């Protein structure tokens with residue numbers, strides 16, 4: 182008799198559920214996973230053990246509530262008649278019935294119009310345990326630190342200011358960054374888009390994450406003084422890394438410990454309005470200038486690595502629907518909008534990325550600039566119209582990281598933006614990138630000098646930095662290897678790998694520049 186298959190399936194996963202609520206069973210799950218982690222040589226056995234113990238609690242809870250949930254598992258196994266499998270099912274937010282205005286590019290600024298200067302910091306990745314002289318090529322996922330051991334005699338230990346390896350930064354190198362800003366300023370505001378702790382993800386307590394938050398926050402406030410700083414939340418701020426339960430998780434395993442600390446650390450910078458949304462889901466909007474609205478998104482709700490989204494990936498925290506409300510209100514007032522975030526939209530989950538793309542196309546006249554980080558290299562994402570995928574209408578700048586991780590010079594970014602006056606377009610006009618050349622900074626007894634690496638319009642011959650200029654740059658680089666090599670050099674903050682980037686590497690790199698929407702290979706149809 183097959184009329185009983187659904188009842189026994191539900192009985193199995195119901196009993197599975199209550200078994201996995203008991204911590205001796207959770208520990209047993211961990212032990213097997215540690216044993217497999219060691220067999221497949223993912224990491225040294227100390228790291229295998231540490232990372233599984235850190236992850237196992239929230240991970241088993243999520244699986245219990247999603248994949249192993251009776252209505253889900255039995256939906257998958259036995260079809261819609263028994264349950265309903267909807268893990269990562271597709272979803273859509275709703276645009277308002279206001280008609281889209283005719284597409285209108287930004288006006289060229291009048292001669293002598295005000296220019297706003299924005300400092301951009303991202304992926305600082307302070308490593309409290311950074312240790313000069315240790316092995317840069319140790320067996321762990323992060324080196325140059327306490328516990329990395331010592332290098333072989335043939336190779337130098339980690340340099341004093343950092344190293345070209347899988348290493349993060351000592352605090353003094355961030356202090357040095359902030360202390361050298363004078364020539365690059367003055368700044369009207371700072372956009373600070375996330376990733377304060379380092380990549381020592383196998384052992385990160387809530388307290389070391391908070392000490393990363395509070396130490397680096399106080400360091401930037403000391404060097405930037407009264408200049409406003411607008412943070413965005415990176416994927417490394419939480420513990421375990423990428424763990425960002427949406428607001429429907431209450432209780433202690435939620436992100437309240439993190440967002441509330443951010444609200445107290447960033448109170449000098451954000452108005453009360455902003456601090457309220459920051460406590461709920463780590464995003465907010467404010468008004469830097471009359472006529473300009475800034476929106477700081479928590480991209481961890483789009484993230485492929487945010488395992489909590491297995492429970493429910495549909496617009497987590499209602500953030501995209503909230504974003505639509507702000508963009509519409511901005512369109513109604515004639516405001517322009519800056520968006521800042523950490524993970525770039527092209528790297529998000531499919532549904533989230535497709536909805537964001539739709540929002541950007543709809544509000545192309547109102548959105549004036551987009552700024553992201555997370556990849557640590559210097560690149561960008563072009564957005565196109567939904568109807569034909571061929572009219573460029575927005576561009577996201579992905580700034581490179583202050584951290585070395587992996588193999589790079591430290592760097593940061595400055596934007597010139599159409600400034601503070603009525604009728605301003607508020608679009609990026611040009612940008613510059615500064616690096617510390619570790620090859621010369623790590624000379625014993627040298628004092629670090631942060632150097633201008635390049636300015637965008639001058640090295641690429643751009644007449645402006647509107648979306649069409651970046652579209653055009655990609656197709657120029659398709660046919661001009663020398664120009665692509667310049668881009669590849671700068672992509673790595675002046676320290677490119679020694680293995681040549683040949684024809685497939687180039688095409689893949691160029692494709693990423695046009696891929697502002699995930700899982701959309703048609704965007705690259707003119708490259709391959």
Ligand SMILES: *[C@@H]1O[C@H](CO)[C@@H](O[C@@H]2O[C@H](CO)[C@@H](O[C@@H]3O[C@H](CO)[C@@H](O)[C@H](O)[C@@H]3O)[C@H](O)[C@H]2NC(C)=O)[C@H](O)[C@H]1NC(C)=O
Pocket residue numbers: 267493494495496497499
């Ligand atoms: C995952 O979370 C999303 C929202 O975060 C859930 O979607 C929500 O589901 C409810 C239940 O169907 C929807 O409510 C319905 O509203 C319609 C119209 O507003 C109304 O006709 C019905 O009476 C019902 O109340 C709600 O609209 C929907 N929200 C969104 C944004 O889609 C979803 O169900 C969750 N999935 C799981 C598996 O928990």
Ligand SMILES: *[C@@H]1O[C@H](CO)[C@@H](O[C@@H]2O[C@H](CO)[C@@H](O)[C@H](O)[C@H]2NC(C)=O)[C@H](O)[C@H]1NC(C)=O
Pocket residue numbers: 385386387388420421433434
């Ligand atoms: C709330 O949940 C967190 C999640 O782990 C608990 O954190 C740990 O607390 C113990 C107690 O000192 C530490 O030894 C661990 O290192 C902590 N883990 C992390 C990742 O920081 C916390 O104890 C819980 N608190 C309450 C009141 O339930």
Ligand SMILES: *[C@@H]1O[C@H](CO)[C@@H](O)[C@H](O)[C@H]1NC(C)=O
Pocket residue numbers: 184
């Ligand atoms: C048992 O399954 C058969 C097959 O569909 C169905 O015709 C029958 O009505 C079911 N019996 C009950 C009591 O639901």
Ligand SMILES: *[C@@H]1O[C@H](CO)[C@@H](O)[C@H](O)[C@H]1NC(C)=O
Pocket residue numbers: 369470471601602
């Ligand atoms: C921007 O301009 C407005 C209106 O002229 C002024 O009130 C405000 O103080 C200005 N802010 C900055 C940072 O220049």
Ligand SMILES: *[C@@H]1O[C@H](CO)[C@@H](O)[C@H](O)[C@H]1NC(C)=O
Pocket residue numbers: 618620621674675676
């Ligand atoms: C960094 O310093 C080394 C040491 O002289 C130099 O050869 C190299 O060209 C420099 N690169 C950049 C991008 O400054």
Ligand SMILES: [Zn+2]
Pocket residue numbers: 304306376555556557582
């Ligand atoms: Zn990072």
Ligand SMILES: [Zn+2]
Pocket residue numbers: 304376415416417523554555556
């Ligand atoms: Zn990141």
